[PDB]
Each structure stands twice: as structure tokens, then as C-alpha cells.
Amino acid sequence: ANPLYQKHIISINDLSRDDLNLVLATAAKLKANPQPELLKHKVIASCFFEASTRTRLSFETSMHRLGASVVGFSDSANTSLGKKGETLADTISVISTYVDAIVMRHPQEGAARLATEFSGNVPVLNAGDGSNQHPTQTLLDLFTIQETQGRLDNLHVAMVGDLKYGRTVHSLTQALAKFDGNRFYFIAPDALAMPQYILDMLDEKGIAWSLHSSIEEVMAEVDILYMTRVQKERLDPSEYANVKAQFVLRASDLHNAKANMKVLHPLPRVDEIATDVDKTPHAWYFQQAGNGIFARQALLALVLNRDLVL
Amino acid sequence: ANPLYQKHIISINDLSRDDLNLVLATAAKLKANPQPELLKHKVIASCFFEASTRTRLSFETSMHRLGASVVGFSDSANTSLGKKGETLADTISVISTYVDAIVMRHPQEGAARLATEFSGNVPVLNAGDGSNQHPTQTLLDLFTIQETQGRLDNLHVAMVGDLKYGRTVHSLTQALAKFDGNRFYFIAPDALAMPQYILDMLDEKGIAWSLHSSIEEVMAEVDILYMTRVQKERLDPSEYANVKAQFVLRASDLHNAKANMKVLHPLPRVDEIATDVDKTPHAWYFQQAGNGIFARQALLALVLNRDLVL
Amino acid sequence: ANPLYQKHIISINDLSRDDLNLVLATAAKLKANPQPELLKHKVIASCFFEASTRTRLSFETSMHRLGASVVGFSDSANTSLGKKGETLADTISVISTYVDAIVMRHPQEGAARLATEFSGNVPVLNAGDGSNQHPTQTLLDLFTIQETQGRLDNLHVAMVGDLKYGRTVHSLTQALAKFDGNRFYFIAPDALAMPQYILDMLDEKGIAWSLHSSIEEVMAEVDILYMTRVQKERLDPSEYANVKAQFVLRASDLHNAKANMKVLHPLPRVDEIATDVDKTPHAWYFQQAGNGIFARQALLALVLNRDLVL
Amino acid sequence: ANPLYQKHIISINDLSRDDLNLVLATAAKLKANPQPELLKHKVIASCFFEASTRTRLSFETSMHRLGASVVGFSDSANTSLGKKGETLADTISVISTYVDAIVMRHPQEGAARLATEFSGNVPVLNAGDGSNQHPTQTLLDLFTIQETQGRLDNLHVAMVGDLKYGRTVHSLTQALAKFDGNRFYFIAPDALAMPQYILDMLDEKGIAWSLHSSIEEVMAEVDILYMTRVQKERLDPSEYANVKAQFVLRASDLHNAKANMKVLHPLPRVDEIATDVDKTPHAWYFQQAGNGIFARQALLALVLNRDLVL
Amino acid sequence: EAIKRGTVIDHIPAQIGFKLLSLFKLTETDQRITIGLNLPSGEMGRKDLIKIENTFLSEDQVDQLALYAPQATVNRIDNYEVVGKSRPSLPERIDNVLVCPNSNCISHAEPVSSSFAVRKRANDIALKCKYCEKEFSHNVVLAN
Amino acid sequence: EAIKRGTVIDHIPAQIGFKLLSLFKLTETDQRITIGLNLPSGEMGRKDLIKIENTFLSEDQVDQLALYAPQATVNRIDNYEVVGKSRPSLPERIDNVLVCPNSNCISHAEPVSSSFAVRKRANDIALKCKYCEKEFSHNVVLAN
């Protein structure tokens, strides 16, 4: 069978370069040639112990595009648990007797990993666990980069915004670090800098990174400009007002951008990207979201189907 | 057609021994040989006027395993009713024009029975009505007993916990009383004793039952140890602390248990069953939950399909 | 100083019969001759961590009737001290630097007793701690019994309703058992019987008590009919309907009542005393409530004023 | 009249060192000789648009200790003035026709200052406006420092915890910087450092300050150890765990402390001062809270009573 | 393995020795401690034994052993000599070590030491919590 | 005093011997155990020492002591003869005994054993939780 058959998908740290390439190649194939009956007769649990409409719609759409059936719930004040007192262990012990795969998002770190210890032979796919992992966001980000740039090595990647608390940027940085010759530009308020542990990991592998106070310093060289949301809460309202101009993007900022350059953003954007960017050929955040469908399909297909029939 | 074709499933009191055997035989067949297209083109309403994630996931999974489509809702503060003022009668009058079957759970006793008076030719399946009935829990319990024990007659069944307010144990006791030679052991706090009306029903049929203050008195003889949840609310916190040791199960308690003995629990368990029981060959509560899928499939199949094609 | 000067008032079990009589004698004096300036320049904290409008109004009115000033709070859902983040210990350590006495009601048993360990020289009066004590309710009940019957010894006292969970009936029984020759009648559904430990205490003191299934069995010999609320949760709706007639009182039930007999109820009485009782000479529950003012004035006066009240 | 008669008390930056000393001297006088009728016949509004039980109790107790009457409100979730529909302007325009002074706490910065523009001749006392000012906290802190150390000049003051977002530590630093020869030690996680603008102010005045990674580096020379709460939100749970040991105090940390040293904390202290500190002679946070009464009495007396207090 | 000076708690039932060390924090000291667990007795079969040098226990400290090692002997040793022999007796109060089984008791969340009044009954021991004033069998309190 | 057969854990730092007994459930056996706490060491000033008869520790079990008694020595004994001396080395992994400092880690509320990957750094040991994947200094995880 394929290397990912019946495997849990919990952390980008568990996925090798070959694994990432395989998911991405499978995504390209399903995108070119859909297989709407591949997972016919499979039932998949969509378990959002923590609610996330955006992620859940995308995942469930992926499930239906392969012909799978879906059961599930979305929590915080409505579900018959997470207020009650049944262990997550017991919840998984039950659910894994029902379904062929469990996709789960949860407010505590480690939750998906714990699930694997109770799911028997049912694969668990992590749709996000606290501030830990969200590997399918990383997969869709990587698929988008590879598709627009034609490669995952020798790139200039700028990351802008809240680099301290972005689960999404940490994961993407680790992922890209599995490839060669990539160079990083970190553009963030000092209060929200990329964490040292990420920087140590980059140093250890001889991967170049530098800090910059404005997008302008790197625009001419950037292949991927990855914007993140700055939660107003994570700063004081005055503090925000003083530094926000250095993490906010408008169409005028793109004048000297390379032709290949794409602007990505995991969404939602509110302030970070002006609507005038939307019409430029560089805006690729909506196409990125759309690619979540193919990345998530590829993952379900690889996990639930022995042989790449594609 | 089969005896259950187009029949409402409202109460264990409405089901004869033959009916129970038929559901259970059908469950065994679908478990051995799935029929994922049996209910193709059927649409089933999953109507949880009272929320119950556990029951709802299980029921909907059953629906999808037969190829049916599902529409529905789960209530208390979100649905556009049960806060408004439309009669349940009108709600059913509408919904029964949409779907091929209605599965419903509701906070008032009698709700499913009332539904049948307004659903025209659309079958209603009761997923629980207040403290009255929950016949598909009873069906899955019975299927689990029959499968592990090879029979439903001449059993020694212990029931432990909150026997006064357990809708689940009352129903299971009535069901087993439709069979011969069964003997019951009731192990409960005095405040939470099995109700007299149940005891009168057992007396009337010459069925043996006895009270015991500890599991140890009956362990050597028990075929089925059916544990129930004791809601902390239904006792005062001190009261609970004083009697809880006599409704709590741990692996050491099973030393002299027969080889065939199974421990069941409708779930959730929190205190009642120590996690160390889980690894013994006697723990069967998760397998029991898993059997809900086959019991619920059998019921949908029998109700919506004239002839047993199996 | 008087025996209660600067003493905490936490539990009826900590108060002697002499203490009880002293509170009652002081209550009669203040009732007969108000002292509106006795506690002039005292500041009292009215701390209702658990809300209780009727008890708080009663207590605060008593404070004003003696001329004290009042600061306080009441928690419906939210305050971040005494519960949420801060320890009750810390809350008391702070509040006992502001005020001259603390009146507190709290959802956990032992709360007021814990307060005394952090209040320094500031007295604490227990306005109710979970299912433990409510000494000023018992004090106002005793005052009302003494006033209408002329004594607290050699009485026939009937207690009706939820005798199991009524903290109020438990303490009234303990209190009355400090006096001589009292005889008790306990009318309660079997699910809600007077706890054994209360029965054991009466037995040890050679105090007569009997159980009765209905009010009429004893109506002809009682001096005090003390009714309590049976909250619907403590039973199942059908169970409630089945038994309720035993613990509900209407005017016709009073036909053979002694002339001196008074009906008491700590309130609210919505579900157990019919309004047709209100106009009989036996109805004394509103007079009882009115006596809360005098009992609570007496306690405040005794605890905060060195000299005995004249 | 005294210099503060009929003045608004909004910001520490509007108060001179002479004003500060005047408040403190008046606080010492009232502490030593109460004047329970000074503000007889005054009516004070206690307007807690933002709830704050501890601050409100403190303020209201102070009002009663001077004999004033009190009317007010506190907003947990709902009032349709000062926020919801009506402008704060209109609310103040109305309330300033009822009362003799307004004490207000509000979630938005500038709220009290805005109140002064609509209060006519009615004085406004700021009980806290968002992340801006909290002058009576600072006044009670200074009183406590002056009392225990005998002076407010030439002190060694350590501030620990969330120095970035603590409005209380910012104003205490400004206040202490109005006096001569004070030296500051700032112990805080790098994410929560004392803001530059405070540092700039100290530099301009030639006031010495240094940064320290832990309490022990300076324990031997501090006269005042002022601790603050680090609320968990301001950091990520793992980040919190990683650094917290630097800003938590236990009794063993005090081995080499000066005899005169006092530990202060504006409270609640649940997460940063161990309870074993409480019994040491250095623990002064509850005494500090008790001093809130005297500082707030002094301010009310000075603002509402023409003549200086004797 | 004899000691010149201190206390020797002898005749502790097996599986209680370590429990005593834990509950009463006996190893939180700089004094020399010597311990034997699962020692042969014949005096009772198997036993535990605890020796604490330069350390002595008040009568009430010895009484706190009652619930766990009712048949123990506490020996006082000075100049290598056994000067005192004592047996635990049921105390009137037990503080610090017990936990109140009432989950709504204020004692759980708070900076206070647990405290129970001890009442010997015919078949067991009744423990009454200082805070919630609920009374429980010692069997129930000791369970957790 | 000498034993015939089993394991002797020597040169345990003071105030660690009791830790070892608790964390590693050493007293949960019927085998004879002799323990010496706060013993004089010419090499350490003071030390702790544990003897467990008829019981033997595997290499990983010995390595599980590394965090607490890095300079301990474990003696395998048979016929009054030391037949093997070993010393704790840092293991790749530490299970069961540690608690994750992350309050939001799923490990806390749940029927699972804690698990940490071990990684030595210049001046401390990094411990990465299997569940939340956060890494902490050992000084933080060990923190009381």
C-alpha cells in the first residue's frame, strides 16, 4: 500500500519530505481528475469539539467530493459533551466503533494524538489541537506554494504579522525547512516575533533567515508573501495602532513585486490585506482556500485507500 | 411484508418476543453482510428536539450505512422551534411531507407517540421521550446480550446503580421479561431502588429477582453485569460519598467471574467503572455501543423495506 | 459583656439552649421597643456569594432598623472573588479590613466557618452555607414558636415535606431537641424521609418521634405544623404527582386543629399551602417572615453591642 | 478652601507631589481619629459601569465611614446608559442633577475625564478607566509605602510581573517619580516589560532604574516589593509555564530581605504570592487593602469638605 | 542497626510503613532515618519499622498513628537505651492528613488544613468535618 | 547492613531517596526493603540508600533514575556478592512519573501516561511532551 495508508495525520513533525510530496502529487491528480466515488460506502466523523466553520465546511466538502458519507457535530454549548465529564478517551472509543475515519478539532494540545491511542484501527486526522498543530492547513499552504511556484526548494518566503502565536506559520516554517535552499524574512512587531525555538531549528539546518521592519525591504525578492492575522486582543489598543502599519498590505506595496510572487493568508483577513490587493494577479488567498479541498481530499484518499488508483 | 414494515417503533411495551427476535436476527445478518445501498434514495429526518450527540451520531451512522440521506436538527437554544410556540403536531405534519421516516428524541414523555398521530404514513422511530422509552437502546442492549451469551432466556442479569431513574434499565427489564427463566439481581442505594411497579410486573410472571448490597454476592453467578450511571445530582454530595463504593466497579472485583460474563453500560461512565476494567475480556461497553449501529440499521431496514432481502 | 458579644454565629450546634433563649429574649425586647440608633456608625457587609433576595432583604432591613450602614454584593453568575479566581480566604481577609461584621451566604458547606479563620476580630454571621446550616432561619422559627405557643418545651411539632434535603428542618429539629419534652411527627414521602442521623440524635436523648403518611393522622394533636417546599427536581414529575397530596395543605384539612396551632413555612410556599389557608387563624408564615427582622436584629445587636439589650 | 476642594480626581498626572502629600496626611488623620459625620447629608453616586466588587466595596465603605449616603449600580452585561444606547454624556448630565459627587469605573479610557465635561459643579472621582488611570489605587499604595517606610523619597522599589499592561504599576511609577532619590527595579518576562515611555520619563528626571530577570538579584536591597498579577491570557499556557517562576514569590525567597521590607500586591494575588508568605512580617497586601479605606475617605473628605481635616 | 538517640516506631503492619512516611512527612528532615519494610515478625508475621534519630513525638503525635497502625509501639531511645514505650490511642481530632469526602465542602479549594472530630462507635470510627459538619465512616474517608 | 541477593541503590543525594520510593512505587512489593536516609558520606557529606531483596532493575529502569540521582550507583547482588555495578545514563524517554507544565495539555484530564522525549542541552535537559509537543527545561517539569 501507499506510505500513508491507514496512518494517523497528527503533526507536521511526523511527516517526511517524501510524505509531503506524495500528498501534494495526489492533490494535483485529484484536482485534474476527480474521483467522486473513490470513498463510496465510507463514513467519516467530522468532530469539531472546537467549532471552526471555515475548516469544517472545507473538510466536509472534501469528504463529499470523494463520495464519502459524513456524520458529526460542532461544539461549545450545544454538543452533549465537553460540559459533561466523559473523557475524550471514551468518546473516541465509542466513535471509532462507528466510522471509518475521524477528523477532529479540539481546544487542547495533544487531543488528536490521544485519540489515536483509543481509535483502534480507525485513522485520526487532526483539524487542529489548541496551539499545537494544524497539519492540513500546512498541507494546503504547501500545495499552493508548489502549484504557483513550481517548487518547494530555493524559495524566498516572507512571513508577516503575528509570528509569535501563529500555529499556522510555525508549522509552515517547519515544513519548508524539510526542503533545501529556502530563505525566510520575518516581519513582525517585537512583541509578536517568531519564537526562538523556530529560529534555533533554522540555525541548526543552516537555513538563512533575517528580520525586517517593513515589507518594502524584501518585496523585490519575495516569491511568497504569507500574511497572518494580528488578533487585536494580543496587543493593547494603542500598541496596535502604533505598529499596525508595518503588518498591513495594500496594492501600492506590490509595485516592484516579481511576476511569480503570490500573496497568501490563512484567513480571515480583516485589516492585514486591503481589498484593493484582491484584483491584482498577486492575491492568492482565495485560491489558497480553494486548494484546501484538494489537499484534504488527497489526505483522505491516501489514508483510506491502499493503492493510488489515479 | 415483514411484521415491522411501515410500523412505528415507540415503546418496548409494543414489541412482542417475536418482534425482538426479528430485529436481532436482522442485526446479525447486516453485521455479517452489509447492504450499503438498501435504503438508497430514502431521506430520513434526524430530529433531536432534545440534544444527544451520542445517540444521534449512532443513529445517523446507521442511516448512512444503508445508503440513506439525512436531514435534521438538534435543539435547545438553536433550532427555530421549542422556544417559539408551534405545536409538535404541526411540526410533524410538516416534516412528514418531506421525509420517508422520522427518528426523534424529545424532552416530554409521549412525544413520539403523538408524532405517529400526525405523520400519516411516515414511520416514527423513538430515540427517547423524557423518562418514558428509548427502545433502540434496549434493542442494542438485547442484541449485545444475545450475541455474547447466545441466548435471551435462562440468564442471570445483575443491574447496578441508579435503578430508580434509569429509563434504560426499566426498559431492559421489561424486555428480558418477555423471555423465560431469567433471574435478576438488583444492586442499588435504597434511595435509588428499582421501582415497585417493575417488581410487581416480575412477580406477576413468576420471574425471580433479589436485592443485594454488593456485586460480590452475585459475581460468581452473573452472566450480564449491567452498570448504570449514578447522576451526582440525584443524591446529595455527602450521601453519594457514603454509598458510592457499592455501585463502583474495578478489575479486582472480577476475579471469580464466569468466562462468559460481560460488563455492559449504556454510557457515559465516569465513576462507575474503573479504567482498569477496560482491558479485561469482560469489558463490553464499547462493543455494546458499536452494536447500536447494527440494531439501529436492522430497525430502519425492517421498517422501510418490505421484504428481508438478506 | 453579653455571652454572644463578638461571637461568630455559624451553626445551631454551637449554640446552647441559653444562647437560643438569650437571642429570643433580645428579639422580644427590640420588637416591643425599637432601638433605631443602637448600631449607629457600624458598617456591615452583606455578602451574598449565593443569591437570596428574601434572606438578603430581611437581613439588610434588620441592619437599618438598628441604624447600621450596609455595603454588599449578590452573585448571579459573576464575581471573581470568594469563588472564581480568588480564594474565599483572600476575599474575607480583605473584607474584614473594611467592615465591623460580615453576614455571608455561600453555595459551599463550611464557607462561613472558613471565613472565621480569616476575619480576625470581625464577627461572621452565617446566612446559609450549602446544605449545612442556616442559623438565623432557625432562630426566627423558634422565636415564632415561642411567641405563639408561649414556650419551646413540651410541644407537639409536625414537620412536612422534604425532610431529607431540608437544611431548615434539620436545624429546627436539633434546636428543638435542646429543649425538654418535645414530640415530633414526620410526614414525608419515603424518598424524602428525615435522615437517620437526626433520628439517632432524638433516640439518644429519649425524645419521642413517629412517622406518618399524611397530615390528618396527627392534625388533632399538633401545636406546630411546619411545612416545607418539595422542589420538583428532587422527584420525577410522575412520582411527584403520585405522592404530592400527602404534603399539600388546604383549609379543609384544618377542621379538627387545636385552637393554638400555627402553620409555618420558611417560604416560598407556592406548591404546598393553598391560598385558602391564608385567612385562617392558623396561617402564620407571613408573621413568621416578619419575625426574621426581630431575630436578625437581636443577633446583630448581641454580637456588636457589648451591653445586654434592655 | 483646601487645594482639592471641589476638584475632579481623574489622573495621577494631574496631581502634584503636594497634592499627594495632602491626601496622605488627611488619610493618616482620619485613620487616627474617625469623623463619622463629616459627610452627613451628602449623596454619592457609586457608578460601576465596569464591575469591580473589591473596588466598589472599598469605595462605598469609605463613603459610609464619613456618614454619606450612597446610590449606585454595577454593570454585569446590562444597563442601557453610559454605554448601550444613551451616551455617557447624557448619563452624567442626568446623574449630576441627583448627587453631590460621582465615583465612576468604566471600561473605556478617558471616561471619567469626559464625565467632568458634563457633571457641572459635581466632582468626579476616577475609580478606573480602561487601561489608563486608577488614581485611588495609587493613593492607597503610596499611603502604605509612606506608613511602613516613613517616607516616599530615597527608596528602593521593586516591581514584579506584568509591567507592560499593569495600569497600577505605571501610575505608581509616575507617582513615585514626583519624589526624590527613588531607585527602581523592574522584574518582568521580556514579553511583559515596563513600557519605554515610562523608562523615558525616568531617564529625563535622572532617576535610576535597572532590569532584573528574577527577584533574588535584588531581594537584599529592596524596601518595597510590589507584586502584580500576570493574567494567563497575556501569554500562552506553555509560555506562562516556562517563565512563571521568575514572578512568583514564596517565603524562602525572603531569607535575606531587609527588616523594613514590605510585600505589596493590588490583589487578587492567587497566582503569584504563595500563602506561606502571609504570616511573615513582610506580607503587607491585606494591610494595603485596608488602607484603601483611609485613602478613599481622605479624597472624599478633601473634595467635598471646604475645610482642611484636623 | 540500633540507634543511640531518638524514636523507633515498631510493629507497623506491612504496607503501612511507607504510608506513614508519606502522610506525616517524616523524611522531611536532616536527621538520620533507618527503615525496614516487610520484616519478618512472628510477633505478627511481617512488619514495617521506622527509626528517626534525635527526634521525639508528643503523645498526640503518637495518637495520629491510631487509624493506620493501632497496634504499633513507639519507643523512646536515649544513650542506646529504651527509656519509653508507647502505644497509640484514638485521638479526639485528626488534622491535615485526611480529605473530606463531601465534594461541595469548602475545604477543597482553600488554604486551610483539613480537620475531623473523632467519635469511636461500636463497629467503626466516625469522622466529622470541622467545615461542612458532615460525618462519615473512617472507612469512607480513608478510601480517598 | 549486607543482603544476600537483589539490588542496592547507593549514593542517592539527600532528599531524593524518598522521592525514588514514591515516584517508582518501590515499596509496592512483599520483598524485604531496607532504607537509610541522611546517612553520612565522606564523598557527599550526606546520602540516601535503598536496598530491595530478590528484585532486579533493567538498564532502562536504572536510567529512569538519571534525572534524580545522576551520580547514584546501582549494585546487582547475589550470594552476598556484588555481581554488577551500573550507573544511570540519560534515557531517550521518560514515562509515567513527570507532569506536563502546559495547563492546556490533553494529558491532564485523561487516562493516559505522561511521556517525554529527552534531549540534553549545555546546562539543562530539554523535555518534550508526547501529547502537546511543547518542550520545557527539566527544571520546569520537575518544579514541585
Ligand SMILES: Nc1ccn([C@@H]2O[C@H](COP(=O)(O)OP(=O)(O)OP(=O)(O)O)[C@@H](O)[C@H]2O)c(=O)n1
Ligand atoms: N538503641 C536501640 C534500642 C532498641 N532499638 C529498637 O527498639 C525496638 C524496641 O526495643 P526493645 O524493647 O529492646 O525490644 P523488645 O523488648 O522486643 O520490644 P517489644 O516487646 O515492643 O517488641 C526494637 O525494634 C529495637 O530494635 C533501637 O533501634 N535502638
Ligand SMILES: Nc1ccn([C@@H]2O[C@H](COP(=O)(O)OP(=O)(O)OP(=O)(O)O)[C@@H](O)[C@H]2O)c(=O)n1
Ligand atoms: N551482600 C551485600 C554486598 C553489598 N552491599 C551494598 O552494596 C553497596 C556496594 O557494595 P561494595 O561495592 O562492596 O562497596 P563499595 O566499595 O563502597 O562500592 P562503591 O565504590 O560503588 O561505593 C554497599 O553500599 C553495600 O552496603 C549489600 O548491601 N549487601
Ligand SMILES: [Zn+2]
Ligand atoms: Zn467537609
Ligand SMILES: [Zn+2]
Ligand atoms: Zn503536554
